[PDB]
Symmetry: C2
Subunit: 163 residues, 2 copies
C-alpha cells in the first residue's frame, strides 16, 4: 500500500495529467511517469491495489471524467477496474491500447460503461480476429452506442427492426 504521503503525490501527478477543458485524464505509461519515478513511487496499474488507489482518486476528484487513457500499462485483465462504471459514471472515452489484453471478453468486466469511443489496438486480442468486420461486431456487442473504434469512425448502428 502507498503511504498517505505517496497517495498525495499520486493525486498530484494525476492532477497534472488531467485536462479540465477536455475532461480527459491521461494515465498513459503511468509507471514510468517522471515525477513518480523521481519520488520513487511505483504505480503498477495492472496490480489490483494500484488500480484501486488510482480509481479512488478519480472517484473523489474527477467524477465528471469523460475520457480516460490507460494505454501502455500492461493491463491484461479489466475486472480490476470493473467498479469504474460506479466511479466514472460519465466516462465515454477509454483508451486501452498498447496493453496486454489477450481477448475481447476482458471487456465484459466494464460492460456497463456507455462508451462512445474506445481503443484496443496494440493488444494481442487484435491478431485474434481476421477482419476489421468481425472485430467491430464483437466489440459493438459490449458497447452498442460506440461511435469510434481505434480512431476510425463507425457506421451508424444498422437496426434491422426499423418500422
Amino acid at each position: 500500500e502507498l503511504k498517505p504521503e505517496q497517495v498525495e503525490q499520486l493525486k498530484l501527478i494525476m492532477s497534472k495529467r488531467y485536462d479540465g477543458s477536455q475532461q480527459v485524464l491521461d494515465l498513459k505509461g503511468l509507471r514510468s511517469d517522471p515525477d513518480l519515478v523521481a519520488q520513487n513511487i511505483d504505480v503498477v496499474l495492472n496490480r489490483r491495489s494500484c488500480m484501486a488507489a488510482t480509481l479512488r482518486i478519480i472517484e473523489e476528484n474527477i467524477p465528471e471524467l469523460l475520457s480516460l487513457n490507460l494505454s501502455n500499462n500492461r493491463l491484461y485483465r479489466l475486472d480490476d477496474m470493473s467498479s469504474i462504471v460506479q466511479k466514472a459514471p460519465n466516462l465515454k472515452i477509454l483508451n486501452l491500447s498498447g496493453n496486454e489484453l489477450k481477448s475481447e471478453r476482458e471487456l465484459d468486466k466494464i460492460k456497463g460503461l456507455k462508451l462512445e469511443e474506445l481503443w484496443l489496438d496494440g493488444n494481442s486480442l487484435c491478431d485474434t480476429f481476421r477482419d476489421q468486420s468481425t472485430y467491430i461486431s464483437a466489440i459493438r456487442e459490449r458497447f452498442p452506442k460506440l461511435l469510434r473504434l481505434d480512431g476510425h469512425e463507425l457506421p451508424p448502428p444498422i437496426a434491422f427492426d426499423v418500422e
Copy 2:
C-alpha cells in the same frame, strides 16, 4: 479451549455442546485439546468425566459456494438471500469459510452473481459483519438490475459508506441494525440522508416512504 478435546469426535462433541448451549471460529487441535461458557462442566462422558470449556478458494470450493448460493436463490422473485452466509450449514460442513466482510470473498460472491444471476433484483447481505461498502462498489456493474438491497444487522458505522454504491438504482433498502442508526437523532434526518444516495428509493427498513416533494 477444550482440554482432552481430541479424545472426542468433533461430530458428537459439536452436537453435544450445541444440545446444551452454534458455528466454528477457525478451529484446530492442539495435543489433547480442541450462552457458551454456560456449557462448561455441563456435558458428561460415558466415562463419567465432565467436558470443560475454558473460554484463496480452490475451484471445487467455488463450485460449492456457487451451489449453495444456487440453493439460496429464488428465481420466482429473483432474490438471492446471503444472510449470515459465513455460518451457512453446508459451507461450514464442507469446511468452507466465506467471510464477506473480506474483499476477496465479496469478490468471488459478486463474480458468481455477475456470471450466473444477471437479472438479480433483490440481494440480502444482512448479518455479514460488513463495515466497508467499497468492496462491493462494482455491485453497480455486476448486478445491473438490482432494486432491493438488505444490509441490516451489519457493522456499518456511517451513512457515507453508501456512497461507494450510489449508482445502484435501488427502490428498497435496509440499514436497520447498523450502529450508523444510533448516529441519527430523528427518523426524519435519517430518511433524507439516505435518499441523498438513493433518490428513487421507495421503501426503507420495511416502511413505505412518502413521495419526494420536489421544489
